[PDB]
């Protein structure tokens, strides 16, 4: 049970290393994410949802025309031209069902790139995005209260747009229960999942305390609300009470002590969350600087420019805003003398904590989320096919349904939807009379696997009965 929870928690920490898309990996803030959500791509209504970088759905369109029709190859291209002319995206987030969905994504990329249809005057790349959490975040009750008119395809496009915006907000908008509907190991059902749910909550609290939460979005956006359920010292009831207080009196945050000046939160509980609450506005209230380190961070910022203080909380603005712009002087600050002054006033050995105070003075509200990771083929294959190559093993018999001949070869599919190419060596031809005696075109035939090349659309399938044993 300990090693199963460790193997599950490693996949959780991998999945809790969020990396949403940003503008150029940094007009307006964020990226206008046009999420595409397909249903079948076979002359079925495929949906698109343009949600802006502020975190709100802005537009939507349908697409019931695809290249169903067997020969009208520009109807999907013409529909995507008329739809992309009616949309102003900044990133195209496409889902994936089969390899035909990858070919449709390639057609959408040919429509976007070969016409400058990423801004209407300049090409903007279409990013491949796996769809496993958005397929279970479009059936959630939160996505059933944002709109009640449209089907789940539009909610899947909106879930892909929100996942490209931030995956931690999706993890902070599913109850925890809802985390136990995503499987990371095939043995987490036999063991008790109460401690596994508490470890998932521990990893979510760790991510929320590393990244941080904004309070000026939890009174405006419902998608960015319910974020205090994973803050330090603020549980579900305390987070719901804080949201009810901030939405009942219309209270806004201009500092961090606004719940201590109005008597909204406990003193010791506010000191626990004195480095986990952040506001858009004092100047060190949107950072991890506590109220017992305000006049030390400001003293090190005054010492980082050699500027005389004006009773600094905001008055010495040259030492305070120019250090938020760029690191001005770090050789004028000495952490040995700073720790010595902290061992006579303040009363505590703060020598490497002042490195974090300096980092907050340089770039406050830093996010520990990792960079956006683009799909590299095994990540693509595992995403769109939902089957990994570690599952298959040499020695197992798999049924393959042949569909087409390549020129003499055997091109088929599996039951899991993976394209396999059996060469003429197993079919018993090179260019000679062909493998009808080995396998039947159209039908499915069991064969013993001898190779695993699912990424490159290859599979070794012995059609000889003497090789199955």
């Amino acid at each position: 049970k300990e090693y199963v929870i460790k193997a599950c928690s490693r996949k959780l920490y991998n999945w809790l290393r969020v990396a949403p898309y940003r503008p150029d990996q940094q007009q307006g803030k964020g990226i206008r994410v046009l999420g595409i959500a397909f249903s079948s791509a076979r002359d079925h209504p495929v949906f698109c949802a343009l949600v802006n970088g502020e975190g709100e759905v802005t537009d939507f369109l349908r697409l019931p025309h695809f290249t169903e029709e067997r020969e009208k190859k520009a109807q999907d291209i013409e529909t995507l031209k008329k739809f992309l002319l009616n949309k102003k995206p900044h990133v195209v987030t496409v889902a994936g069902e089969n390899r035909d969905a990858q070919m449709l994504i390639e057609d959408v990329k040919r429509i976007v790139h070969e016409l400058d249809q990423g801004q209407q005057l300049s090409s903007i790349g279409v990013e491949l995005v796996d769809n496993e959490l958005a397929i279970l975040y479009m059936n959630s009750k939160k996505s059933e209260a944002e709109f009640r008119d449209y089907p789940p395809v539009l909610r899947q496009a909106v879930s892909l747009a929100r996942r490209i915006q931030d995956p931690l907000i999706e993890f902070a908008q599913v109850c925890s229960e809802d985390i136990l509907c995503l499987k990371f190991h095939p043995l987490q059902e036999h063991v008790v999942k109460e401690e596994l749910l508490n470890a998932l909550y521990c990893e979510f609290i760790n991510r929320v305390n590393e990244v941080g939460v904004d309070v000026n979005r939890a009174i405006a956006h419902p998608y960015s609300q319910a974020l205090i359920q994973y803050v330090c010292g603020l549980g579900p009831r305390k987070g719901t009470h804080l949201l009810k207080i901030l939405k009942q009196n219309n209270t806004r945050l201009e500092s961090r002590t606004q719940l201590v000046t109005m008597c909204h939160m406990g003193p010791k509980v506010f000191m626990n969350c004195a480095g986990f609450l952040k506001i858009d506005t004092e100047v060190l209230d949107g950072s991890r600087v506590h109220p017992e380190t305000y006049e030390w961070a400001r003293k090190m910022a005054v010492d980082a420019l050699e500027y005389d203080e004006s009773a600094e909380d905001a008055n010495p603005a040259g030492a305070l805003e120019e250090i938020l712009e760029n690191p001005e002087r770090l050789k004028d600050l000495d952490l040995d003398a700073f720790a010595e002054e902290l061992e006579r006033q303040g009363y505590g050995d703060k020598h490497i904590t002042l490195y974090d105070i300096r980092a907050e003075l340089s770039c406050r509200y830093k996010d520990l989320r990792t960079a956006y990771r683009s799909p590299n083929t095994e990540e693509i294959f595992n995403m769109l096919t939902k089957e990994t190559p570690e599952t298959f093993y040499i020695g197992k018999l798999i049924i393959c349904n042949v569909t087409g001949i390549a020129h003499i070869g055997v091109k088929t599919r599996l039951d899991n939807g993976v394209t396999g190419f059996i060469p003429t060596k197993f079919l018993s031809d090179k260019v000679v009379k062909r493998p009808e005696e080995r396998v039947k075109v159209g039908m499915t035939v069991h064969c013993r696997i001898m190779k695993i090349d699912i990424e490159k659309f290859s599979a070794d399938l012995t059609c000889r009965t003497s090789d199955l044993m």
């Binding site: 330090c232 549980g235 009831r237």
Partner: protein, 43 residues
């Protein structure tokens, strides 16, 4: 009813739900618990 003790106390909500059966660890228990966690945290 039962949320007033969570929302009206000067204790954290996570700290309340982290030592719910017995709250707090005293000074005289501190070193013995440190040695017990040192012996038991190694397996």
């Amino acid at each position: 009813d039962q949320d007033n003790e969570i929302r009206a106390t000067d204790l954290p909500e996570r700290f309340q739900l982290r030592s719910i059966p017995v709250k707090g660890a005293e000074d005289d228990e501190l070193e013995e618990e440190a040695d017990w966690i040192y012996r038991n945290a190694f397996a």
